[PDB]
Swiss-Prot record:
Induction entry: Up-regulated in proliferating fetal lung fibroblasts and in U-937 myeloid leukemia cells. Down-regulated in these cells by growth arrest and differentiation. In other cell types which cannot leave the cell cycle, such as tumoral HT-1080 and Hep-G2, levels are consistently up-regulated.
Domain Ubiquitin-like: 8-83
Binding partners and assembly: Homodimer; disulfide-linked. Binds methylated CpG containing oligonucleotides. Interacts with H3; the interaction has a preference for the 'Lys-9' trimethylated form of H3 (H3K9me3). Interacts with PCNP. Interacts with HDAC1. Interacts directly with CCNE1; the interaction ubiquitinates CCNE1 and appears independent of CCNE1 phosphorylation. Interacts with CCND1; the interaction ubiquitinates CCND1 and appears independent of CCND1 phosphorylation. Interacts with p53/TP53 and RB1. Interacts with UBE2I. Interacts with ZNF618. Interacts with UHRF1. Interacts with FANCD2. Interacts with ATR.
Domain notes: The YDG domain recognizes and binds 5-hydroxymethylcytosine (5hmC).
Annotated function: E3 ubiquitin ligase that plays important roles in DNA methylation, histone modifications, cell cycle and DNA repair. Acts as a specific reader for 5-hydroxymethylcytosine (5hmC) and thereby recruits various substrates to these sites to ubiquitinate them. This activity also allows the maintenance of 5mC levels at specific genomic loci and regulates neuron-related gene expression. Participates in cell cycle regulation by ubiquitinating cyclins CCND1 and CCNE1 and thereby inducing G1 arrest. Also ubiquitinates PCNP leading to its degradation by the proteasome.
Post-translational modification: May be autoubiquitinated; which may lead to proteasomal degradation. Phosphorylated. Phosphorylation may be mediated by CDK2.
Disease implicated: Associated with various cancers. DNA copy number loss is found in multiple kinds of malignancies originating from the brain, breast, stomach, kidney, hematopoietic tissue and lung.
Superkingdom: Eukaryota
Protein name: E3 ubiquitin-protein ligase UHRF2
Portion held of the full protein: 1 to 76 of 802
Taxonomic classification: Eukaryota, Metazoa, Chordata, Craniata, Vertebrata
Subcellular location field: Nucleus; Chromosome
Species in which this protein is naturally found: Homo sapiens
Amino acid sequence: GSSGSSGMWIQVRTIDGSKTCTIEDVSRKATIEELRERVWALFDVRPECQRLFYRGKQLENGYTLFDYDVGLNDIIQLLVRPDSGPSSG
């Protein structure tokens, strides 16, 4: 199945620039949906509230790093959204 002796890591820095993390255990064919989960567990921010930007390109979800051709140790600006109302299912 998912092969890859060595794993991939990236630096998730907040657009503002206050805190930076280093997500590990990443695959070249790893979907973005799986990535958010991490940033959502570390920064405790929903996968929809937290925004990911790379090279001035609003990173999309559903596709795999391969699709976007992401590099190893690539910095991606993280922009989270505020409450934005009590809106809740």
